[PDB]
Amino acid sequence: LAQAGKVRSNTPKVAKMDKPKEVRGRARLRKIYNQRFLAVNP
Amino acid sequence: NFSRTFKKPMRPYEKERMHKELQVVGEYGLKNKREIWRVSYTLSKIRHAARELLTLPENDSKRIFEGAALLRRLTKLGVLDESKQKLDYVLSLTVNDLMDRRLQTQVHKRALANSVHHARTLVSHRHISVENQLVNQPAFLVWKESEKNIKYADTSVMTTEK
Amino acid sequence: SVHIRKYIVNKLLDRKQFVIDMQHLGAKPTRDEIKDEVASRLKANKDLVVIFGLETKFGGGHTTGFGFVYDSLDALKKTEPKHRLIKAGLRRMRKNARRQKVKVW
Amino acid sequence: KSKACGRLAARKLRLAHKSNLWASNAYRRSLGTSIYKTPLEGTSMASGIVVGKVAVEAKQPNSAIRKAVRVQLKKNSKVVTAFVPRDGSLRLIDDNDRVLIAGMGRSGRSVGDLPGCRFKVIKVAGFSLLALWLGKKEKP
RNA sequence: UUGUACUUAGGGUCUUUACCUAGGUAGGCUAUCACGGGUAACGGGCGGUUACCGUCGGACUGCCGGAGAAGGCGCCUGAGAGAUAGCGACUAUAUCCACGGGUAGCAGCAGGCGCGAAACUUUCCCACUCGAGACUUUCGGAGGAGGUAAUGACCAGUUCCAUUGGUUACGUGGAUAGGGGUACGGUUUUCCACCGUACCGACUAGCAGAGGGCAGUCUGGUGCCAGCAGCUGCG
RNA sequence: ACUUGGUUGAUCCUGCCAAGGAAGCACACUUAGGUCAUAGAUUAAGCCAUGCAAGUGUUAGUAACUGCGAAUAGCUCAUUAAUACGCUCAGAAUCUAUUUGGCGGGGAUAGCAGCAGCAACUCUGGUGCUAAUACA
């Protein structure tokens, strides 16, 4: 009880890598379809 | 009042069902996985109606009126040919047949859009019409009669404005 | 382009009444313009025509609406509602101030 | 066989069915009511004032102290232990605040390692722990 | 079960009857569940779940019928009331008083206090639907319209089409929108928002997880501690 | 018209516990746009400031009187376990404004005019007249 939330404070807190934003909606699913089913595929 | 047009699937994380449903979405150029599940639910009300008709006698007053009326409505939609117009062939039909009758895909067959995705863009941006009437909606369902009448609405395609 | 459609001669308010079905391409008809076109067609004058409640469709060059035409000025003085007369060209005070006539004798 | 099948024998079947429902524990629990004498009072979520902070520990084999607050309820004026999820979080709660409590999610019974308590704290001070733990909302 | 059950006579009622008062019999209901107790019980059309059979819910249910106006109780007027935005008294809350005395019933529409996990505007309107009346005119918080809310249902966007180099998705090449803005024409009783028409144009994704039930044996920190975890389990 | 994890060294069982699908209240995180519907029932049928909700004038009864309305509509589910509700019948045991069709056959007050009384109210006293499809 003396020690609580110790692990969370004592982590070496990390800067997030900022990224190009994803194409939403149909493009996400189209980008999956041709990545997955076009090639190389069973 | 109201109704539930699509239904959710029974089991979420089946491999075969998810792997099936991507290459219906990919071929017909589609937004979500729910825009399948409505067309599954549309196929249900066709077939549940059909099967009940099948159970009845071959002469009953209900079958004669309904059976002729049911096949009339599907010959409009252009699923049943006149070869297959005989009531048992209603219990066939797939989502791949019923997806093909939509406006998105009928533009593509027409080739005006040039792509399944392109067809969606043409309809969503007010370019396409059906007998002098604009259709914003990318799931119209065209009745074969009117399939011939698919054409450019006016704007960029005809007007030529930037 | 002015189609007159579903047309009946109501003699009780002596008026010939219908719905108009005009189709326009390119998307640009003014109500005043409409009176011009209809009045030539039914030898009417512009004042004797009432046209009301006309509705463009989704997207396309189209518009349809109600309207009716009557002999003389004698109809619209008496048969018409008041909200079309002020529009064309012809407040709770009672609830408050009014019920003081019960409160005071 | 093993029951009355005859044409006129529908009183025997209907009345024997009513008896056999009282063996079923779900019909028994609903009907007895039997639920009112409960801290929750049959309500999914309840709120009230924190008394203090308590360390209750897990059974076996799991050696860990869990940190569940004692909370007085508003409507009954009873007291009951209640688990506080996420690391930190006991530090975020503060003494003598109002909190919203809800169930362990097990539809009654006692859940994980943790015996006794059947309750978790959803909000404090009208904010929610997830927001607090994540730190996209604040407390004074 | 004691007007409790039949009978004969009366009173009373709009009429029939223990509805009530008389005389005469001693009957009625019950294991095909009487009587008593409980209900987190208004009944019904129906709603949710389903392969069939069923099963749970039904304040509301966009309707139907019943009951109630803070709690009983009584009564006038009328075709119709045991009316409650009618009257009468008592009781319980509340409030005024010049200390004599009184005043009021939001389970109508808004709004507040309290209650709690839990539920909106003190707006505009008689034009639509209809209703009352001496009535084509008056009036209607019935009704209609806006305004706030991820509560619920359907619809739907976050781009597209070309081809240069790295293994067909990871500086170019151009296109096409609506979100939005500004007019005017429709629209409605009036706004809003919609549906058009023309001119401005090179900010739009999270939430939940990655042992198994049901996508990493990555790198870093932690060391039955913090913590996760519906269940089995992990440290 | 569907299964899978969990008692064992392993097995096949009985067996539940979980997972899994739907809705309906509530909490949460996140959010271009459109149409449409609903929203203090669950607990306190607990309590209420203020504003407004039932009034009614025609060419044809004479601010009032007179006539009709206010017993409907709206709200809520606390009573009620069948007397209510539903669904079949029944009135030869009944009542019914309004509509509709038959059959019929002079005097006394209200506003108006005036004198007063209360801390107060949409309470009134008293005198001086006059109305009728009101009253006799």
mmCIF file of N, CA and C in Angstrom, chain B residues 35-147:
data_model
loop_
_atom_site.group_PDB
_atom_site.id
_atom_site.type_symbol
_atom_site.label_atom_id
_atom_site.label_comp_id
_atom_site.label_asym_id
_atom_site.label_seq_id
_atom_site.Cartn_x
_atom_site.Cartn_y
_atom_site.Cartn_z
ATOM 1 N N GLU B 35 -22.448 -2.944 -45.386
ATOM 2 C CA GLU B 35 -23.102 -2.811 -46.693
ATOM 3 C C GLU B 35 -23.189 -4.127 -47.488
ATOM 4 N N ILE B 36 -22.483 -5.168 -47.038
ATOM 5 C CA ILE B 36 -22.821 -6.553 -47.393
ATOM 6 C C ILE B 36 -24.038 -7.028 -46.604
ATOM 7 N N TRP B 37 -23.971 -6.892 -45.277
ATOM 8 C CA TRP B 37 -24.925 -7.538 -44.361
ATOM 9 C C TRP B 37 -26.386 -7.101 -44.544
ATOM 10 N N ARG B 38 -26.607 -5.896 -45.071
ATOM 11 C CA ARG B 38 -27.941 -5.485 -45.527
ATOM 12 C C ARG B 38 -28.415 -6.296 -46.741
ATOM 13 N N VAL B 39 -27.502 -6.565 -47.674
ATOM 14 C CA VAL B 39 -27.817 -7.302 -48.900
ATOM 15 C C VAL B 39 -27.985 -8.802 -48.618
ATOM 16 N N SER B 40 -27.283 -9.309 -47.604
ATOM 17 C CA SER B 40 -27.613 -10.607 -47.001
ATOM 18 C C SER B 40 -29.023 -10.633 -46.414
ATOM 19 N N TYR B 41 -29.368 -9.589 -45.665
ATOM 20 C CA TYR B 41 -30.701 -9.453 -45.060
ATOM 21 C C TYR B 41 -31.820 -9.201 -46.082
ATOM 22 N N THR B 42 -31.485 -8.556 -47.199
ATOM 23 C CA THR B 42 -32.400 -8.417 -48.340
ATOM 24 C C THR B 42 -32.636 -9.752 -49.050
ATOM 25 N N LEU B 43 -31.577 -10.549 -49.185
ATOM 26 C CA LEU B 43 -31.679 -11.906 -49.733
ATOM 27 C C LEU B 43 -32.484 -12.861 -48.838
ATOM 28 N N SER B 44 -32.484 -12.615 -47.527
ATOM 29 C CA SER B 44 -33.259 -13.418 -46.575
ATOM 30 C C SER B 44 -34.770 -13.282 -46.769
ATOM 31 N N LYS B 45 -35.254 -12.043 -46.856
ATOM 32 C CA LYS B 45 -36.691 -11.767 -47.033
ATOM 33 C C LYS B 45 -37.253 -12.243 -48.377
ATOM 34 N N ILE B 46 -36.396 -12.311 -49.395
ATOM 35 C CA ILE B 46 -36.736 -12.951 -50.668
ATOM 36 C C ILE B 46 -36.931 -14.458 -50.459
ATOM 37 N N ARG B 47 -35.950 -15.102 -49.830
ATOM 38 C CA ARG B 47 -35.902 -16.565 -49.743
ATOM 39 C C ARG B 47 -36.826 -17.149 -48.668
ATOM 40 N N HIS B 48 -36.963 -16.457 -47.533
ATOM 41 C CA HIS B 48 -37.931 -16.845 -46.487
ATOM 42 C C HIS B 48 -39.375 -16.773 -46.983
ATOM 43 N N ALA B 49 -39.683 -15.730 -47.755
ATOM 44 C CA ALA B 49 -40.958 -15.629 -48.474
ATOM 45 C C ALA B 49 -41.141 -16.751 -49.495
ATOM 46 N N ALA B 50 -40.088 -17.030 -50.261
ATOM 47 C CA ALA B 50 -40.124 -18.054 -51.309
ATOM 48 C C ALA B 50 -40.362 -19.468 -50.776
ATOM 49 N N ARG B 51 -39.621 -19.834 -49.735
ATOM 50 C CA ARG B 51 -39.705 -21.159 -49.143
ATOM 51 C C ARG B 51 -41.084 -21.440 -48.578
ATOM 52 N N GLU B 52 -41.678 -20.448 -47.929
ATOM 53 C CA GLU B 52 -43.005 -20.632 -47.369
ATOM 54 C C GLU B 52 -43.978 -20.912 -48.504
ATOM 55 N N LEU B 53 -43.795 -20.214 -49.620
ATOM 56 C CA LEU B 53 -44.647 -20.407 -50.783
ATOM 57 C C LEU B 53 -44.489 -21.830 -51.295
ATOM 58 N N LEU B 54 -43.262 -22.331 -51.256
ATOM 59 C CA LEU B 54 -42.959 -23.686 -51.702
ATOM 60 C C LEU B 54 -43.666 -24.760 -50.876
ATOM 61 N N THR B 55 -43.756 -24.553 -49.568
ATOM 62 C CA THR B 55 -44.407 -25.527 -48.698
ATOM 63 C C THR B 55 -45.887 -25.706 -49.045
ATOM 64 N N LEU B 56 -46.575 -24.604 -49.324
ATOM 65 C CA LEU B 56 -47.993 -24.643 -49.709
ATOM 66 C C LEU B 56 -48.278 -25.606 -50.880
ATOM 67 N N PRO B 57 -49.567 -25.955 -51.104
ATOM 68 C CA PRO B 57 -49.964 -26.766 -52.272
ATOM 69 C C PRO B 57 -49.727 -26.124 -53.649
ATOM 70 N N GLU B 58 -49.846 -26.943 -54.697
ATOM 71 C CA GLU B 58 -49.424 -26.590 -56.061
ATOM 72 C C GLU B 58 -50.637 -26.274 -56.948
ATOM 73 N N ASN B 59 -51.374 -25.231 -56.559
ATOM 74 C CA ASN B 59 -52.822 -25.043 -56.855
ATOM 75 C C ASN B 59 -53.535 -24.085 -55.883
ATOM 76 N N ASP B 60 -53.015 -23.971 -54.655
ATOM 77 C CA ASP B 60 -53.525 -23.039 -53.634
ATOM 78 C C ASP B 60 -53.633 -21.586 -54.127
ATOM 79 N N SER B 61 -54.646 -20.880 -53.625
ATOM 80 C CA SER B 61 -54.925 -19.483 -53.990
ATOM 81 C C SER B 61 -53.790 -18.519 -53.621
ATOM 82 N N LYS B 62 -53.094 -18.812 -52.522
ATOM 83 C CA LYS B 62 -51.979 -17.983 -52.047
ATOM 84 C C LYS B 62 -50.755 -18.079 -52.965
ATOM 85 N N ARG B 63 -50.450 -19.289 -53.433
ATOM 86 C CA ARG B 63 -49.277 -19.531 -54.281
ATOM 87 C C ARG B 63 -49.404 -18.921 -55.678
ATOM 88 N N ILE B 64 -50.613 -18.942 -56.243
ATOM 89 C CA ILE B 64 -50.844 -18.470 -57.616
ATOM 90 C C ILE B 64 -50.669 -16.950 -57.708
ATOM 91 N N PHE B 65 -51.260 -16.227 -56.758
ATOM 92 C CA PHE B 65 -51.164 -14.766 -56.708
ATOM 93 C C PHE B 65 -49.760 -14.297 -56.327
ATOM 94 N N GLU B 66 -49.213 -14.881 -55.262
ATOM 95 C CA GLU B 66 -47.912 -14.477 -54.723
ATOM 96 C C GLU B 66 -46.755 -14.883 -55.640
ATOM 97 N N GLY B 67 -46.811 -16.106 -56.167
ATOM 98 C CA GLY B 67 -45.738 -16.660 -56.991
ATOM 99 C C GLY B 67 -45.528 -15.916 -58.297
ATOM 100 N N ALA B 68 -46.628 -15.568 -58.960
ATOM 101 C CA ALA B 68 -46.590 -14.693 -60.136
ATOM 102 C C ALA B 68 -46.123 -13.271 -59.794
ATOM 103 N N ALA B 69 -46.578 -12.749 -58.655
ATOM 104 C CA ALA B 69 -46.209 -11.401 -58.200
ATOM 105 C C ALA B 69 -44.748 -11.291 -57.756
ATOM 106 N N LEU B 70 -44.220 -12.356 -57.152
ATOM 107 C CA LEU B 70 -42.824 -12.404 -56.699
ATOM 108 C C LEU B 70 -41.830 -12.427 -57.862
ATOM 109 N N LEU B 71 -42.104 -13.268 -58.857
ATOM 110 C CA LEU B 71 -41.226 -13.409 -60.024
ATOM 111 C C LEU B 71 -41.271 -12.187 -60.947
ATOM 112 N N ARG B 72 -42.432 -11.533 -61.012
ATOM 113 C CA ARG B 72 -42.593 -10.242 -61.698
ATOM 114 C C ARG B 72 -41.653 -9.157 -61.155
ATOM 115 N N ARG B 73 -41.520 -9.093 -59.830
ATOM 116 C CA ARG B 73 -40.666 -8.093 -59.163
ATOM 117 C C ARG B 73 -39.166 -8.365 -59.312
ATOM 118 N N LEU B 74 -38.790 -9.627 -59.524
ATOM 119 C CA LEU B 74 -37.385 -10.013 -59.714
ATOM 120 C C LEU B 74 -36.930 -9.975 -61.177
ATOM 121 N N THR B 75 -37.867 -10.138 -62.111
ATOM 122 C CA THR B 75 -37.608 -9.900 -63.538
ATOM 123 C C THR B 75 -37.398 -8.414 -63.860
ATOM 124 N N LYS B 76 -38.073 -7.532 -63.119
ATOM 125 C CA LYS B 76 -37.702 -6.111 -63.066
ATOM 126 C C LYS B 76 -36.234 -5.945 -62.689
ATOM 127 N N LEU B 77 -35.878 -6.401 -61.489
ATOM 128 C CA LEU B 77 -34.523 -6.226 -60.950
ATOM 129 C C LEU B 77 -33.432 -6.878 -61.805
ATOM 130 N N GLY B 78 -33.797 -7.894 -62.586
ATOM 131 C CA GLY B 78 -32.919 -8.448 -63.616
ATOM 132 C C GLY B 78 -31.982 -9.512 -63.080
ATOM 133 N N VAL B 79 -32.487 -10.312 -62.141
ATOM 134 C CA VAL B 79 -31.746 -11.423 -61.554
ATOM 135 C C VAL B 79 -32.156 -12.709 -62.278
ATOM 136 N N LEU B 80 -33.462 -12.968 -62.312
ATOM 137 C CA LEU B 80 -34.023 -14.105 -63.038
ATOM 138 C C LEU B 80 -34.173 -13.785 -64.523
ATOM 139 N N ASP B 81 -33.520 -14.586 -65.365
ATOM 140 C CA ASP B 81 -33.869 -14.686 -66.788
ATOM 141 C C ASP B 81 -35.188 -15.436 -66.990
ATOM 142 N N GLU B 82 -35.691 -15.397 -68.221
ATOM 143 C CA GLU B 82 -36.946 -16.068 -68.584
ATOM 144 C C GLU B 82 -36.783 -17.590 -68.730
ATOM 145 N N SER B 83 -35.544 -18.051 -68.916
ATOM 146 C CA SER B 83 -35.190 -19.467 -68.750
ATOM 147 C C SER B 83 -35.440 -19.982 -67.329
ATOM 148 N N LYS B 84 -35.037 -19.187 -66.337
ATOM 149 C CA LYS B 84 -35.040 -19.595 -64.924
ATOM 150 C C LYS B 84 -36.278 -19.112 -64.137
ATOM 151 N N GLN B 85 -37.316 -18.636 -64.827
ATOM 152 C CA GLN B 85 -38.455 -17.984 -64.168
ATOM 153 C C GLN B 85 -39.474 -19.021 -63.677
ATOM 154 N N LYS B 86 -39.133 -19.691 -62.572
ATOM 155 C CA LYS B 86 -39.933 -20.809 -62.050
ATOM 156 C C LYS B 86 -39.700 -21.108 -60.554
ATOM 157 N N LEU B 87 -39.566 -20.062 -59.737
ATOM 158 C CA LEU B 87 -39.964 -20.082 -58.314
ATOM 159 C C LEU B 87 -38.992 -20.823 -57.371
ATOM 160 N N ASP B 88 -38.619 -22.056 -57.714
ATOM 161 C CA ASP B 88 -37.476 -22.743 -57.089
ATOM 162 C C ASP B 88 -36.139 -22.012 -57.284
ATOM 163 N N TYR B 89 -35.962 -21.366 -58.436
ATOM 164 C CA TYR B 89 -34.730 -20.616 -58.735
ATOM 165 C C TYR B 89 -34.594 -19.307 -57.937
ATOM 166 N N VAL B 90 -35.658 -18.903 -57.238
ATOM 167 C CA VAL B 90 -35.576 -17.860 -56.208
ATOM 168 C C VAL B 90 -34.753 -18.320 -54.994
ATOM 169 N N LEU B 91 -34.892 -19.589 -54.602
ATOM 170 C CA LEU B 91 -34.115 -20.155 -53.485
ATOM 171 C C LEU B 91 -32.606 -20.223 -53.755
ATOM 172 N N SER B 92 -32.215 -20.248 -55.029
ATOM 173 C CA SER B 92 -30.852 -19.890 -55.443
ATOM 174 C C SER B 92 -30.590 -18.380 -55.215
ATOM 175 N N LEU B 93 -29.849 -17.719 -56.112
ATOM 176 C CA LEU B 93 -29.411 -16.321 -55.944
ATOM 177 C C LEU B 93 -28.388 -16.131 -54.816
ATOM 178 N N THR B 94 -27.357 -15.340 -55.109
ATOM 179 C CA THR B 94 -26.298 -15.015 -54.154
ATOM 180 C C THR B 94 -26.271 -13.501 -53.975
ATOM 181 N N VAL B 95 -25.556 -13.039 -52.952
ATOM 182 C CA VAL B 95 -25.215 -11.613 -52.822
ATOM 183 C C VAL B 95 -24.402 -11.069 -54.008
ATOM 184 N N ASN B 96 -23.602 -11.925 -54.647
ATOM 185 C CA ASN B 96 -22.864 -11.550 -55.864
ATOM 186 C C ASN B 96 -23.763 -11.209 -57.060
ATOM 187 N N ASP B 97 -24.916 -11.871 -57.158
ATOM 188 C CA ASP B 97 -25.947 -11.511 -58.143
ATOM 189 C C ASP B 97 -26.620 -10.175 -57.817
ATOM 190 N N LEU B 98 -26.984 -9.991 -56.550
ATOM 191 C CA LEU B 98 -27.808 -8.854 -56.117
ATOM 192 C C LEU B 98 -26.991 -7.565 -55.965
ATOM 193 N N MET B 99 -25.713 -7.703 -55.603
ATOM 194 C CA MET B 99 -24.745 -6.596 -55.671
ATOM 195 C C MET B 99 -24.527 -6.065 -57.088
ATOM 196 N N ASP B 100 -24.584 -6.950 -58.081
ATOM 197 C CA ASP B 100 -24.327 -6.576 -59.479
ATOM 198 C C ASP B 100 -25.378 -5.624 -60.069
ATOM 199 N N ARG B 101 -26.594 -5.656 -59.525
ATOM 200 C CA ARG B 101 -27.681 -4.786 -59.984
ATOM 201 C C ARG B 101 -27.609 -3.339 -59.483
ATOM 202 N N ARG B 102 -26.715 -3.039 -58.537
ATOM 203 C CA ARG B 102 -26.607 -1.682 -57.982
ATOM 204 C C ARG B 102 -25.976 -0.692 -58.969
ATOM 205 N N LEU B 103 -26.104 0.596 -58.657
ATOM 206 C CA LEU B 103 -25.783 1.672 -59.597
ATOM 207 C C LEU B 103 -24.282 1.809 -59.811
ATOM 208 N N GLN B 104 -23.536 1.821 -58.706
ATOM 209 C CA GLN B 104 -22.071 1.736 -58.713
ATOM 210 C C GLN B 104 -21.547 0.763 -59.768
ATOM 211 N N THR B 105 -22.021 -0.478 -59.696
ATOM 212 C CA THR B 105 -21.537 -1.553 -60.563
ATOM 213 C C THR B 105 -22.058 -1.431 -62.000
ATOM 214 N N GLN B 106 -23.291 -0.948 -62.163
ATOM 215 C CA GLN B 106 -23.872 -0.725 -63.496
ATOM 216 C C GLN B 106 -23.231 0.430 -64.272
ATOM 217 N N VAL B 107 -22.633 1.381 -63.554
ATOM 218 C CA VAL B 107 -21.781 2.409 -64.167
ATOM 219 C C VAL B 107 -20.490 1.789 -64.727
ATOM 220 N N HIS B 108 -19.910 0.893 -63.931
ATOM 221 C CA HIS B 108 -18.670 0.200 -64.247
ATOM 222 C C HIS B 108 -18.839 -0.691 -65.459
ATOM 223 N N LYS B 109 -19.943 -1.429 -65.498
ATOM 224 C CA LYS B 109 -20.206 -2.311 -66.620
ATOM 225 C C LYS B 109 -20.335 -1.406 -67.823
ATOM 226 N N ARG B 110 -21.006 -0.281 -67.610
ATOM 227 C CA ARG B 110 -21.194 0.713 -68.651
ATOM 228 C C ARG B 110 -19.812 1.226 -69.012
ATOM 229 N N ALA B 111 -18.975 1.353 -67.986
ATOM 230 C CA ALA B 111 -17.600 1.819 -68.130
ATOM 231 C C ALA B 111 -17.461 3.336 -68.152
ATOM 232 N N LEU B 112 -18.548 4.053 -67.894
ATOM 233 C CA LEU B 112 -18.464 5.502 -67.906
ATOM 234 C C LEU B 112 -17.495 5.960 -66.829
ATOM 235 N N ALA B 113 -17.609 5.374 -65.642
ATOM 236 C CA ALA B 113 -16.723 5.720 -64.535
ATOM 237 C C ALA B 113 -15.283 5.313 -64.817
ATOM 238 N N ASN B 114 -15.128 4.123 -65.381
ATOM 239 C CA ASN B 114 -13.812 3.571 -65.709
ATOM 240 C C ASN B 114 -13.230 2.697 -64.598
ATOM 241 N N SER B 115 -13.861 2.723 -63.430
ATOM 242 C CA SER B 115 -13.423 1.914 -62.297
ATOM 243 C C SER B 115 -14.581 1.729 -61.332
ATOM 244 N N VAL B 116 -14.529 0.689 -60.505
ATOM 245 C CA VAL B 116 -15.603 0.473 -59.546
ATOM 246 C C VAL B 116 -15.624 1.644 -58.579
ATOM 247 N N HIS B 117 -14.440 2.030 -58.121
ATOM 248 C CA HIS B 117 -14.289 3.157 -57.209
ATOM 249 C C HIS B 117 -14.646 4.471 -57.883
ATOM 250 N N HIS B 118 -14.245 4.601 -59.143
ATOM 251 C CA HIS B 118 -14.514 5.808 -59.910
ATOM 252 C C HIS B 118 -16.015 6.006 -60.064
ATOM 253 N N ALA B 119 -16.740 4.908 -60.247
ATOM 254 C CA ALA B 119 -18.184 4.983 -60.403
ATOM 255 C C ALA B 119 -18.811 5.578 -59.153
ATOM 256 N N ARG B 120 -18.312 5.185 -57.988
ATOM 257 C CA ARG B 120 -18.844 5.706 -56.737
ATOM 258 C C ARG B 120 -18.623 7.211 -56.671
ATOM 259 N N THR B 121 -17.439 7.639 -57.086
ATOM 260 C CA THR B 121 -17.087 9.049 -57.073
ATOM 261 C C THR B 121 -17.974 9.874 -58.000
ATOM 262 N N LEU B 122 -18.285 9.325 -59.168
ATOM 263 C CA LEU B 122 -19.127 10.018 -60.136
ATOM 264 C C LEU B 122 -20.539 10.257 -59.603
ATOM 265 N N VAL B 123 -21.084 9.253 -58.921
ATOM 266 C CA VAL B 123 -22.442 9.323 -58.333
ATOM 267 C C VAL B 123 -22.504 10.170 -57.054
ATOM 268 N N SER B 124 -21.470 10.070 -56.217
ATOM 269 C CA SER B 124 -21.374 10.861 -54.981
ATOM 270 C C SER B 124 -21.132 12.359 -55.226
ATOM 271 N N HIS B 125 -20.606 12.703 -56.402
ATOM 272 C CA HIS B 125 -20.344 14.088 -56.796
ATOM 273 C C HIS B 125 -21.340 14.593 -57.860
ATOM 274 N N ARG B 126 -22.547 14.017 -57.889
ATOM 275 C CA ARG B 126 -23.672 14.529 -58.685
ATOM 276 C C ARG B 126 -23.439 14.570 -60.206
ATOM 277 N N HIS B 127 -22.670 13.622 -60.734
ATOM 278 C CA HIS B 127 -22.387 13.582 -62.176
ATOM 279 C C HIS B 127 -23.338 12.677 -62.962
ATOM 280 N N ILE B 128 -23.883 11.648 -62.314
ATOM 281 C CA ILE B 128 -24.649 10.605 -63.001
ATOM 282 C C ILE B 128 -26.150 10.789 -62.756
ATOM 283 N N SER B 129 -26.945 10.490 -63.787
ATOM 284 C CA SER B 129 -28.408 10.583 -63.740
ATOM 285 C C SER B 129 -29.058 9.354 -64.381
ATOM 286 N N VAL B 130 -30.357 9.193 -64.128
ATOM 287 C CA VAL B 130 -31.157 8.074 -64.645
ATOM 288 C C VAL B 130 -32.474 8.608 -65.238
ATOM 289 N N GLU B 131 -32.521 8.725 -66.571
ATOM 290 C CA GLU B 131 -33.615 9.395 -67.302
ATOM 291 C C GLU B 131 -33.872 10.812 -66.784
ATOM 292 N N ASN B 132 -32.991 11.732 -67.172
ATOM 293 C CA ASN B 132 -33.011 13.153 -66.759
ATOM 294 C C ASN B 132 -33.155 13.472 -65.246
ATOM 295 N N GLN B 133 -32.897 12.488 -64.379
ATOM 296 C CA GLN B 133 -33.100 12.623 -62.933
ATOM 297 C C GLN B 133 -31.788 12.281 -62.239
ATOM 298 N N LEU B 134 -31.257 13.227 -61.466
ATOM 299 C CA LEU B 134 -29.975 13.043 -60.787
ATOM 300 C C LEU B 134 -30.102 12.000 -59.680
ATOM 301 N N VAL B 135 -29.065 11.176 -59.542
ATOM 302 C CA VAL B 135 -28.972 10.180 -58.476
ATOM 303 C C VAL B 135 -27.660 10.393 -57.719
ATOM 304 N N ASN B 136 -27.758 11.047 -56.564
ATOM 305 C CA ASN B 136 -26.651 11.110 -55.610
ATOM 306 C C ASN B 136 -26.342 9.752 -54.974
ATOM 307 N N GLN B 137 -27.364 8.907 -54.834
ATOM 308 C CA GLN B 137 -27.273 7.698 -54.015
ATOM 309 C C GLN B 137 -26.549 6.554 -54.745
ATOM 310 N N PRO B 138 -25.437 6.052 -54.174
ATOM 311 C CA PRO B 138 -24.615 5.062 -54.874
ATOM 312 C C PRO B 138 -25.130 3.612 -54.822
ATOM 313 N N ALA B 139 -26.201 3.350 -54.071
ATOM 314 C CA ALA B 139 -26.933 2.082 -54.153
ATOM 315 C C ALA B 139 -28.391 2.324 -54.567
ATOM 316 N N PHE B 140 -28.618 2.366 -55.880
ATOM 317 C CA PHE B 140 -29.940 2.626 -56.460
ATOM 318 C C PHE B 140 -30.745 1.343 -56.692
ATOM 319 N N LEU B 141 -30.072 0.292 -57.172
ATOM 320 C CA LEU B 141 -30.704 -0.898 -57.775
ATOM 321 C C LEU B 141 -31.507 -0.570 -59.040
ATOM 322 N N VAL B 142 -30.933 -0.894 -60.197
ATOM 323 C CA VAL B 142 -31.487 -0.522 -61.504
ATOM 324 C C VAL B 142 -32.263 -1.704 -62.098
ATOM 325 N N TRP B 143 -33.367 -1.408 -62.785
ATOM 326 C CA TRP B 143 -34.354 -2.424 -63.178
ATOM 327 C C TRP B 143 -34.265 -2.857 -64.655
ATOM 328 N N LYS B 144 -33.058 -2.905 -65.226
ATOM 329 C CA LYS B 144 -32.799 -3.597 -66.511
ATOM 330 C C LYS B 144 -33.444 -2.923 -67.735
ATOM 331 N N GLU B 145 -34.768 -2.762 -67.702
ATOM 332 C CA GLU B 145 -35.480 -1.673 -68.390
ATOM 333 C C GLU B 145 -34.689 -0.358 -68.424
ATOM 334 N N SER B 146 -34.425 0.195 -67.243
ATOM 335 C CA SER B 146 -33.721 1.468 -67.098
ATOM 336 C C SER B 146 -32.198 1.382 -67.047
ATOM 337 N N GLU B 147 -31.648 0.177 -67.124
ATOM 338 C CA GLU B 147 -30.199 0.033 -67.074
ATOM 339 C C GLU B 147 -29.573 0.776 -68.242
#
